[PDB]
Amino acid sequence: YHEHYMRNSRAIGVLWAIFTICFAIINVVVFIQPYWVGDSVSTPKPGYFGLFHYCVGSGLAGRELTCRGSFTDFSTIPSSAFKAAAFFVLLSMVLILGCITCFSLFFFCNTATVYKICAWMQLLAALCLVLGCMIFPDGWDAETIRDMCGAKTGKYSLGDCSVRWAYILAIIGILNALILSFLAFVLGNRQTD
Amino acid sequence: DSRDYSTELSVTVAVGASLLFLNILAFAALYYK
Amino acid sequence: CLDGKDCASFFCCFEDCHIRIAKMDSYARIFFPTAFCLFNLVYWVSYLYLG
Numbered sequence: 677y678h679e680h681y682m683r684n685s686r687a688i689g690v691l692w693a694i695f696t697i698c699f700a701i702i703n704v705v706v707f708i709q710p711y712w713v714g715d716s717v718s719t720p721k722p723g724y725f726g727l728f729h730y731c732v733g734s735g736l737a738g739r740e741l742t743c744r745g746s747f748t749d750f751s752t753i754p755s756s757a758f759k760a761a762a763f764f765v766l767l768s769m770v771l772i773l774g775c776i777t778c779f780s781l782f783f784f785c786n787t788a789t790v791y792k793i794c795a796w797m798q799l800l801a802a803l804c805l806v807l808g809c810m811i812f813p814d815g816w817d818a819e820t821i822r823d824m825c826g827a828k829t830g831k832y833s834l835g836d837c838s839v840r841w842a843y844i845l846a847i848i849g850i851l852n853a854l855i856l857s858f859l860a861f862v863l864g865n866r867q868t869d
Numbered sequence: 870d871s872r873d874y875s876t877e878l879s880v881t882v883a884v885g886a887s888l889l890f891l892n893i894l895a896f897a898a899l900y901y902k
Numbered sequence: 903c904l905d906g907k908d909c910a911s912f913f914c915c916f917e918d919c920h921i922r923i924a925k926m927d928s929y930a931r932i933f934f935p936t937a938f939c940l941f942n943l944v945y946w947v948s949y950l951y952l953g
């Protein structure tokens with residue numbers, strides 16, 4: 677029974693590491709790509725906006741997407757809520773990359789201790805992502821977002837614009853991060869047996 | 870460009886469901902004593 | 903309390919912990935290159951491909 681126990685624990689640990697890497701990839705992708713919200717058929721102008729970057733059309737029956745915004749210059753970010761959401765998603769990315777670094781501790785430190793360390797780090801990343809996703813809709817009152825979407829758009833209200841793949845992927849990232857946090861906790865308490 | 874995002878959200882939700890199902894299978898393998 | 907373990911023991915670490923402080927060189931030897939490699943990977947990928 678003990679060898680099956682060890683084999684299952686090792687396999688589930690490897691799978692947990694793989695899914696942690698996948699969630700880190702997801703976190704990086706949702707942080708970078710500006711496809712959180714986007715235009716619709718009834719929108720006055722086309723385009724999209726992410727956490728800090730955003731592209732908007734000129735409005736002459738073509739693409740002509742003028743793009744502006746950069747996290748390395750907070751002056752270009754439309755709103756303080758957008759700044760806070762971008763900062764929180766960045767903090768979540770830093771935390772999950774910190775766990776991926778802490779994978780190295782398995783050589784030396786106790787396996788249960790390392791599992792608990794990444795359990796707490798992944799949980800904190802999940803809270804950071806949750807805070808970012810709650811704070812990001814707060815900034816839809818900004819003048820640029822109102823110009824892009826319409827007058828009906830407002831705080832905590834899509835209006836004419838629609839959620840795109842990055843926002844729902846961030847929600848999926850929250851779910852995956854919380855799940856991996858509990859998985860790490862159970863693995864850490866399982867290694868001691 | 871058609872400004873309809875249906876297949877995009879569908880594939881995103883499908884990939885997310887696959888990942889989440891794998892992690893729930895991880896919980897299953899753990900909690901199955 | 904599905905385990906019924908005390909939550910602080912189940913989740914947190916009051917057991918043992920620091921004591922393992924002399925091995926910080928051994929930890930750093932692997933930690934710092936890994937952190938730098940991860941930083942370089944994310945940085946270059948983000949600036950070259952994703953944006």
Ligand SMILES: CCCCCCCC/C=C\CCCCCCCC(=O)O[C@H](COC(=O)CCCCCCCCCCCCCCC)COP(=O)(O)OC[C@@H](O)CO
Pocket residue numbers: 685686689690693694697776777779780781782783784785786787936
């Ligand atoms: C693009 C980004 C790529 C991500 C790159 C991530 C790489 C980051 C750097 C180093 C990883 C270090 C992993 C080393 C794990 C080595 C673990 C090991 O040696 O085997 C045993 C099992 O451990 C365990 O179950 C823990 C298992 C750890 C699993 C983590 C390593 C798997 C990485 C698989 C790569 C997948 C990539 C695919 C991405 C698409 C523990 O030993 P041991 O009993 O003697 O100790 C007992 C104690 O008394 C003293 O250590």
Ligand SMILES: CCCCCCCCCCCC(=O)OC[C@H](COP(=O)([O-])O)OC(=O)CCCCCCCCCCC
Pocket residue numbers: 927928929931932935
């Ligand atoms: C230039 C690179 C040189 C690599 C040399 C590889 C030697 C590998 C042998 C295994 C490591 C080992 O057991 O000895 C060194 C230390 C532990 O030493 P000790 O004081 O416990 O006896 O082990 C450690 O505590 C940390 C070992 C880290 C090895 C290298 C990590 C990757 C570095 C990336 C360089 C870019």
Ligand SMILES: CC(C)CCC[C@@H](C)[C@H]1CC[C@H]2[C@@H]3CC=C4C[C@@H](O)CC[C@]4(C)[C@H]3CC[C@]12C
Pocket residue numbers: 708746747748766769770773774777937938940941942944945948949953
């Ligand atoms: C120390 C280890 C564990 C974590 C390292 C985290 C690294 C990968 C983080 C920290 C700060 C991050 C950067 C912060 C801001 C920006 C601007 C954005 O427009 C592109 C991504 C970019 C350039 C980020 C890339 C990833 C980054 C460099």
Ligand SMILES: CCCCCCCCCCCCCCCC(=O)O
Pocket residue numbers: 938939942950
């Ligand atoms: C010894 C390990 C070091 C790990 C860090 C390696 C980072 C090297 C980066 C060198 C500059 C890369 C420039 C790339 C330009 C390009 O992609 O076209």
Ligand SMILES: CCCCCCCCCC
Pocket residue numbers: 697700701704705940943944947
């Ligand atoms: C294919 C997109 C790759 C984005 C970078 C992923 C980095 C994962 C953490 C090192």
Ligand SMILES: CCCCCCCCCC
Pocket residue numbers: 920
């Ligand atoms: C075990 C105590 C470690 C204290 C580290 C202090 C770091 C100071 C950074 C300014």
Ligand SMILES: [Cl-]
Pocket residue numbers: 728745746747748749
């Ligand atoms: Cl930027």
